[model samples]
Target chain A: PMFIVNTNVPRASVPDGFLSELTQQLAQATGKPPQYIAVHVVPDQLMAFGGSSEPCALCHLHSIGKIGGAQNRSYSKLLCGLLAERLRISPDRVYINYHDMNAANVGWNNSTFA
Target chain B: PMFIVNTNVPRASVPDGFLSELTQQLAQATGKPPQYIAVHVVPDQLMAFGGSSEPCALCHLHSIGKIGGAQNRSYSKLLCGLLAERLRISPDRVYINYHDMNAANVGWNNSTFA
Candidate 1:
């Protein structure tokens, strides 16, 4: 089964029938009917501040959308839950810290459904 | 007229009558009926990775939910647009980078309606 992964792209930027386009491309490239193609938007900060030391403060503010709430602690957990469900992974397995940089750092929070 | 602002809190964490609560609080706090209240959920990476240098990479992964998407560039712009609509701000006025951390950083991207 081949998966089409879209990261950091905006919902509006996606062409009409993005899902279909991805399916077609995947089928042609991988020679299989794409079973699941997950499309998500990871925000621009990940790239803009790609290598910033204080990227968390800047990125989190936009990524999780928790700019001025006093109850940010609670908000963070909810974000984790939402991300886990979207990525089809265990919440525990999902890490939301900026300490380590790797593939896991991708798609951890790119759900437009939220 | 008054406005209630909620940040970094999750849609689920918010009480059933969250909108009402903010309205009431603002009314009491300012002695006026709350005209508008905006609620948004900035991911927890801002806090968990608080005071870190590479927060953007970690926070963006979970906050934007773009772990495995290849089209992240497009996703980021779409997210900014969604956020601007929710916050009732102009897309150009809305800066979506991880630099110059400040209050503008707050409420910059906390819309769960996304």
Candidate 2:
């Protein structure tokens, strides 16, 4: 499973079904299926990068795998490109932090993914 | 730096200065200074944990260190409790995914932290 949370974009600025669109894009980005992708857009919160708050975003990507190493550069580029195109945030102002979560630590259906 | 994002809570439900309050709690949880903590509460977005959409939350915590191993349990417990008390989300229904970011990959002031 993969989850993406975008912090700093206002909900008012997001388009309808953007999460679904993002889910699709994430599947491509991570080589995961669409069914296992989840996206959250939390808009219009407070944030500052480089002492400026000009439409910046801090995206956290949580996944079981498909993160880290040289591939991160690709993931970062694609995600930053998406932000620039969709959210009007510059690549220099955004950060995509990747987390490789162990399945055993994840809870679902009242049980751990392990 | 440490960042916490609460996905699934609605903005309308968050009390005033809640982010600052969370920033303080995160500082305590991670042993970091308050000035280095950033909390983002993204309210009322769509989420389904364990195939249900109850008052659940998926919290993502990103920091340079103080994540993983046995320490994660304490952080998880404290964050879940905070979500329970503040957002009324059940502990069982929440997940806190941690990311240990590389300083070189983090950008600020038009340059990388490295």
Candidate 3:
């Protein structure tokens, strides 16, 4: 019932076993129906944070339920740490854009999830 | 102007023809210039919906203008059907994340799109 995360990172290539780890984190972090949650990772893209393209990344998380300010801050710290650990991008160089989805806006099987 | 689609799938490889069709649909479905729309297809991801490594896919459609409730519903129907038909994933298992982006946030050529 949800597409939980989409991310863009500037790199020559993604690490081995990147997507598997991402899927696990999203499943655990989002606190929704993990079975219904899906995550996407778009690596090796041309993206800039602030004004430079120095190993920066932009991430967006969208979900239909159970999220807000506290959760956002927690997830931010968690994901920032992960990217820094895995991709070597620091917290300041990473900008996350989180969206709480309207169920009516998501589509499954030619119909709205709402 | 848009980076209209980003999709992640569990299949190890995608067909050569998938992206062309997807880009076309994104252009027509979102009612934006096909030329300005950029679509990304990331295949062979490790994702679980409901904790299973099924042949599922997650997709996001982001656009800068001309979008809302009615438009989202229509595009969802279009893409869900297409994914089901082409990718063989049940509409119930496929998730589409639709985003209406603030121009001030998205960047291209090292500047804010706004």
Candidate 4:
């Protein structure tokens, strides 16, 4: 599983433990092992939401399963809460996109996961 | 189209003109108008590929169309070359994920693209 975050917040402003904390958080949320979870924080980008640039975040979570449908609402709540606390981004301004990737499409260690 | 890059390269090390250069490259590569292209560079992150910390990148290209299957291979070549040139990251260490998004799922301003 991989969690990628894009936000307008500067990287320097992000807490030092944010990435590891997010990794642990996602592991618990998705029932995946922390070793398999990859978290990326790409902050200080140019972004605007609702015609304003006041701390907006666009996030993507790519995993094989255990996501979609009503599950997304739950993730939205959980992730938005985290982002608000750590990045100071508002819930209303965040958009989380869930992607269910096939193992064949995921590559690692010089080969595809398949 | 939205092109987001997550890399081990430090953001400060990236060329000042890289993002705009990529925007133009994608315009020519995908035939998408430059005005509609959004590029984000997220650098200086903790990342590893094949158990190595050497420079690596994970990219996502989200668009309504003009991508899939054989097209992905083409994009890999094009994007890999760009990353190598701009970020000094080798093409073999790069991974590009192509997402064909539904217009209804994309939001802008106060509403979705749909």
Candidate 5:
């Protein structure tokens, strides 16, 4: 019931001992093992495509970026894959959504809708 | 207490059977109705505005692009309207933080801040 969003963790920028920290934090917060945590690293450019600007994209992008890009996506795949694998679920089992796109395009402004 | 994020599932690209599959898995996972699960998808351009590039932007943008763009935002409306919709939260309650902007602006590095 929890979704963790991250963007752009390139290989070059990853820090030492980062995954351990993530594993630790996730374990403490979710009571789930490191493998249970699904990590998705989207690049800054992709963040922009989602309809946000640099600093904004960097919010989640930076976190993922820190973990190292290849590794980040790998981690994400592992997490999602693990969920699907363990539960016998498919990629569709996962749901992905965007806030900015919804705000910009949807009639979110309508009082009746609200 | 969980926020899910995804970019560019442009209406043009949404696959057949996507929604029903999502509902089924969500219901199964939470043991609650699919309504308990939240979905978001941004745009190719907004994803860019968020500060990512084409393919990356395409990453989440495409999803929001689908759903015809209009109805999507309204879904977000009630979702945020009540807790921040029901939970008594701040604008921060929704936690709309951006990293692309954050890293671009923040003194993230002491040496770089350096």
Candidate 6:
């Protein structure tokens, strides 16, 4: 599964179903199927950019196996691009936190996938 | 700053005030204040455990300088405990992904915290 967490964008600024857009984009970026992606959006958060509120975002992605390596740079680019286009926020104002996890460390149902 | 991301629990499954409760408890768990903690709750996600859907949850946390080490175990226990008591999900069904980020890697407003 995958999660695209957007911090800094206010709920007021997000369009309805925008998260689905993020889910699809993230799936394409990570090569995961859309059905397996889980999206979470946090808006107008108490976040700061250089300690100021300047329409910045922190998009964090966590997935099993499809993260890391040189692909990290691309993840930043595509996600940043999406925010800029959809939210009208600048790319320089965005940051991404990405993680590649093991099945064992990620639990499901009632136990670890490991 | 800290993020408490809950995966697996469905949005409909959450009580109206549960996320707020989570925000408080997470702050207590990590010694951060409620204002500095950003809570992301993903409910009824397309997640699996051992390849089945069984009310499992994956909680990922990303914070600047407040994660990692032996305390990681406690972070799991505290977060898992919260999910169990409130959502009625078992601890075994939950996972915690915690990250301690650098100030620079996390940007806000218009620039990096570093």
Taking all chains together, each candidate's TM-score versus the true structure is 0.22, 0.58, 0.66, 0.62, 0.25, 0.58
**Maximum-lDDT candidate:** 4
Per-residue lDDT of candidate 1, residues B4-107 (tens digit): 12234233443444334433443343333332222123333332224432322121212222223443345446544444444333344333322222222222
Ordered from best to worst TM-score, the candidate numbers read: 3, 4, 2, 6, 5, 1
What interface RMSD do all candidates show, one decimal each? 15.8, 4.8, 2.7, 4.9, 14.9, 6.4
Runs in model 4 deviating more than 4 A are: B1-5, B11-43, B46-56, B61-114
Q: Score residue A33 of candidate 1 by CA lDDT.
A: 40
lDDT of each: 0.31, 0.70, 0.67, 0.78, 0.32, 0.68
For candidate 2, give the DockQ. 0.14
True contacts kept of each: 0.01, 0.12, 0.59, 0.05, 0.00, 0.14
DockQ head-to-head 5 vs 6, winner = 6
Task: Let me know the TM-score candidate 4 reaches against the reference structure.
Answer: 0.62
DockQ, cand. 3: 0.42
Q: Specify the CAPRI tier of model 4.
A: incorrect
Q: Per-residue lDDT for A57 in model 1?
A: 19
Tens digits of lDDT, candidate 2, B6-113: 457678877787777788878887898887787777677766544445677766667777765556777676777767788878777776666678889778779877
Q: Which has the higher TM-score value, candidate number 1 or candidate number 3?
A: 3
TM-score of chain B of 2: 0.88
Q: Per-residue alpha-carbon lDDT of model 4 for B10-79, expressed as tens digits? A: 8788998988888998888778889889999978886654334678887778887876555566666777
Predicted model with the maximum DockQ: 3
Instruction: State the local distance difference test value for candidate 4.
Output: 0.78
Please count the clashing residue pairs in each candidate, in the order shown.
Answer: 48, 9, 2, 0, 79, 12
lDDT of 2 at A62: 78
Show where candidate 5 strays beyond 4 Å.
A1-4, A8-11, A49-52, A57-114, B1-114
| Chain B TM-score for the candidates in order | 0.29, 0.88, 0.81, 0.93, 0.32, 0.86
